[PDB]
Design an enzyme around this catalytic site. Sequence first.
Site, PDB file in Angstrom:
ATOM      1  N   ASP A  49      -0.032   3.411  -4.283  1.00  0.00           N
ATOM      2  CA  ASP A  49       1.406   3.367  -4.453  1.00  0.00           C
ATOM      3  C   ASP A  49       1.853   4.518  -5.344  1.00  0.00           C
ATOM      4  OD1 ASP A  49       1.263   2.805  -7.175  1.00  0.00           O
ATOM      5  OD2 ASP A  49       1.983   0.744  -6.981  1.00  0.00           O
ATOM      6  N   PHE A  89       7.396  -9.922  -6.409  1.00  0.00           N
ATOM      7  CA  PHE A  89       7.290  -9.873  -4.957  1.00  0.00           C
ATOM      8  C   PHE A  89       6.331 -10.940  -4.423  1.00  0.00           C
ATOM      9  CE2 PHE A  89       3.184  -7.861  -5.457  1.00  0.00           C
ATOM     10  CZ  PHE A  89       3.314  -7.202  -6.666  1.00  0.00           C
ATOM     11  N   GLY A  90       5.672 -11.663  -5.325  1.00  0.00           N
ATOM     12  CA  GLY A  90       4.677 -12.635  -4.901  1.00  0.00           C
ATOM     13  C   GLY A  90       3.252 -12.164  -5.145  1.00  0.00           C
ATOM     14  N   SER A  91       2.337 -12.572  -4.272  1.00  0.00           N
ATOM     15  CA  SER A  91       0.940 -12.171  -4.384  1.00  0.00           C
ATOM     16  C   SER A  91       0.497 -11.503  -3.092  1.00  0.00           C
ATOM     17  CB  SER A  91       0.056 -13.392  -4.665  1.00  0.00           C
ATOM     18  OG  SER A  91       0.364 -13.966  -5.925  1.00  0.00           O
ATOM     19  N   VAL A  92       0.029 -10.261  -3.195  1.00  0.00           N
ATOM     20  CA  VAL A  92      -0.356  -9.498  -2.015  1.00  0.00           C
ATOM     21  C   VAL A  92      -1.863  -9.294  -1.950  1.00  0.00           C
ATOM     22  CG1 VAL A  92      -0.023  -7.378  -0.716  1.00  0.00           C
ATOM     23  CG2 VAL A  92       1.819  -8.271  -2.134  1.00  0.00           C
ATOM     24  N   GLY A 112      -2.215  -7.179  -5.689  1.00  0.00           N
ATOM     25  CA  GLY A 112      -1.294  -7.268  -6.807  1.00  0.00           C
ATOM     26  C   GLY A 112      -0.432  -8.516  -6.733  1.00  0.00           C
ATOM     27  N   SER A 113       0.240  -8.839  -7.833  1.00  0.00           N
ATOM     28  CA  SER A 113       1.173  -9.956  -7.841  1.00  0.00           C
ATOM     29  C   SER A 113       2.328  -9.683  -8.795  1.00  0.00           C
ATOM     30  CB  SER A 113       0.460 -11.253  -8.249  1.00  0.00           C
ATOM     31  OG  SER A 113       0.225 -11.308  -9.648  1.00  0.00           O
ATOM     32  N   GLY A 114       3.440 -10.377  -8.588  1.00  0.00           N
ATOM     33  CA  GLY A 114       4.607 -10.172  -9.427  1.00  0.00           C
ATOM     34  C   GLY A 114       5.848 -10.757  -8.784  1.00  0.00           C
ATOM     35  N   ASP A 161      16.013  -1.792  -3.885  1.00  0.00           N
ATOM     36  CA  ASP A 161      15.018  -1.708  -4.945  1.00  0.00           C
ATOM     37  C   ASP A 161      14.133  -0.486  -4.730  1.00  0.00           C
ATOM     38  OD1 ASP A 161      13.861  -2.676  -7.328  1.00  0.00           O
ATOM     39  OD2 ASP A 161      12.401  -3.901  -6.244  1.00  0.00           O
TER      40      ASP A 161
HETATM   41  C1  6S3 Z   1      -8.732   0.602  -5.437  1.00  0.00           C
HETATM   42  N1  6S3 Z   1      -7.833   0.809  -4.292  1.00  0.00           N
HETATM   43  C2  6S3 Z   1      -6.475   1.088  -4.779  1.00  0.00           C
HETATM   44  C3  6S3 Z   1      -5.518   1.322  -3.621  1.00  0.00           C
HETATM   45  N2  6S3 Z   1      -5.545   0.185  -2.673  1.00  0.00           N
HETATM   46  C4  6S3 Z   1      -4.435  -0.425  -2.234  1.00  0.00           C
HETATM   47  C5  6S3 Z   1      -4.420  -1.022  -0.978  1.00  0.00           C
HETATM   48  C6  6S3 Z   1      -3.269  -1.654  -0.523  1.00  0.00           C
HETATM   49  C7  6S3 Z   1      -2.134  -1.690  -1.323  1.00  0.00           C
HETATM   50  C8  6S3 Z   1      -0.908  -2.363  -0.838  1.00  0.00           C
HETATM   51  C9  6S3 Z   1      -0.485  -2.361   0.420  1.00  0.00           C
HETATM   52  C10 6S3 Z   1       0.641  -3.071   0.447  1.00  0.00           C
HETATM   53  C11 6S3 Z   1       1.463  -3.376   1.448  1.00  0.00           C
HETATM   54 CL1  6S3 Z   1       1.122  -2.817   3.044  1.00  0.00          CL
HETATM   55  C12 6S3 Z   1       2.593  -4.145   1.207  1.00  0.00           C
HETATM   56  C13 6S3 Z   1       2.835  -4.578  -0.088  1.00  0.00           C
HETATM   57  C14 6S3 Z   1       4.044  -5.410  -0.395  1.00  0.00           C
HETATM   58  N3  6S3 Z   1       4.298  -5.578  -1.689  1.00  0.00           N
HETATM   59  O1  6S3 Z   1       4.728  -5.889   0.508  1.00  0.00           O
HETATM   60  N4  6S3 Z   1       1.980  -4.244  -1.064  1.00  0.00           N
HETATM   61  C15 6S3 Z   1       0.896  -3.499  -0.795  1.00  0.00           C
HETATM   62  N5  6S3 Z   1      -0.071  -3.058  -1.596  1.00  0.00           N
HETATM   63  C16 6S3 Z   1      -0.189  -3.296  -3.052  1.00  0.00           C
HETATM   64  C17 6S3 Z   1      -2.148  -1.094  -2.579  1.00  0.00           C
HETATM   65  C18 6S3 Z   1      -3.299  -0.461  -3.034  1.00  0.00           C
HETATM   66  C19 6S3 Z   1      -6.906  -0.218  -2.254  1.00  0.00           C
HETATM   67  C20 6S3 Z   1      -7.816  -0.400  -3.458  1.00  0.00           C
END
Ligand code: 6S3
Length: 272
Positions: free
Chosen positions: A95, A16-19, A12-14, A134
């Site tokens: 999430d 918070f940046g890009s993860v 994801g991204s936003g 947050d």
């Molecule tokens: C289709 N699946 C959906 C759930 N999935 C998943 C895996 C990791 C994350 C995830 C972990 C994570 C961590 Cl440990 C930190 C942060 C952050 N913003 O600091 N974001 C994370 N996400 C999105 C979210 C969804 C795997 C793929």
Amino acid sequence: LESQYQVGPLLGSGGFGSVYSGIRVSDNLPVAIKHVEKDRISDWGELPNGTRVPMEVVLLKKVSSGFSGVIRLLDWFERPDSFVLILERPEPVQDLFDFITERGALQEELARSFFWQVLEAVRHCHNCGVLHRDIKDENILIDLNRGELKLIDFGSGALLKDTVYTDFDGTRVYSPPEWIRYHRYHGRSAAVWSLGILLYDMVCGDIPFEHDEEIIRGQVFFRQRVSSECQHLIRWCLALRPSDRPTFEEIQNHPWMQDVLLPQETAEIHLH
Ligand SMILES: CN1CCN(c2ccc(-c3cc4c(Cl)cc(C(N)=O)nc4n3C)cc2)CC1
């Protein structure tokens, strides 16, 4: 960095940046790899050595020791124009926001277990001198196998203090009326208000307020059948005057919070 970890899909991204999903090559440990542009960084901090990093790193280091319901920082790197954070990643995980999107309003037994674990995680942060700022379903991960919740994204946080805060960069619809009206709040009571929003979000399937006007009025309407004890806890957390809000101890001693499931029970019953 790019040799230590194998990078997978963007998660994801936003703000918070890009993860990215990732795997530490050393031992195949699942990780999440988060990139933050220096330009887009709002609040900076300092490490015990004196080097200047994003506050997020300072805060994560203060809470990332031991076990808890907080995602752990495994490592960080600086690049010319960004910082890269390496975070532990449970698998499978979802999430809480997506989880609520899927399943709608949660059964109270499940909301109780989840909410309890959020409380324990927020207490840990506060004990470590960290204020998250947050707290919301988007910033909570569910370890689907163990039934354990994990707090993420401390990028809007601050060191905990007993004096007033006059800055805020978190999510507005979770922010307290005293911030909306006066741009002043204190840490613990602001946090409790956002826990009220969160709990409402869990048992109703959406947040109670969308507009400044609603936040300031602080009138709570329930659109789903919710027990009187849960309604009472929520409205207590959402007290208009900060000092009328419960302490963490009062929340966890509330009648609605009794007899919580263990995480593994929770997964077995509700996350199969
Ligand atoms: C289709 N699946 C959906 C759930 N999935 C998943 C895996 C990791 C994350 C995830 C972990 C994570 C961590 Cl440990 C930190 C942060 C952050 N913003 O600091 N974001 C994370 N996400 C999105 C979210 C969804 C795997 C793929």
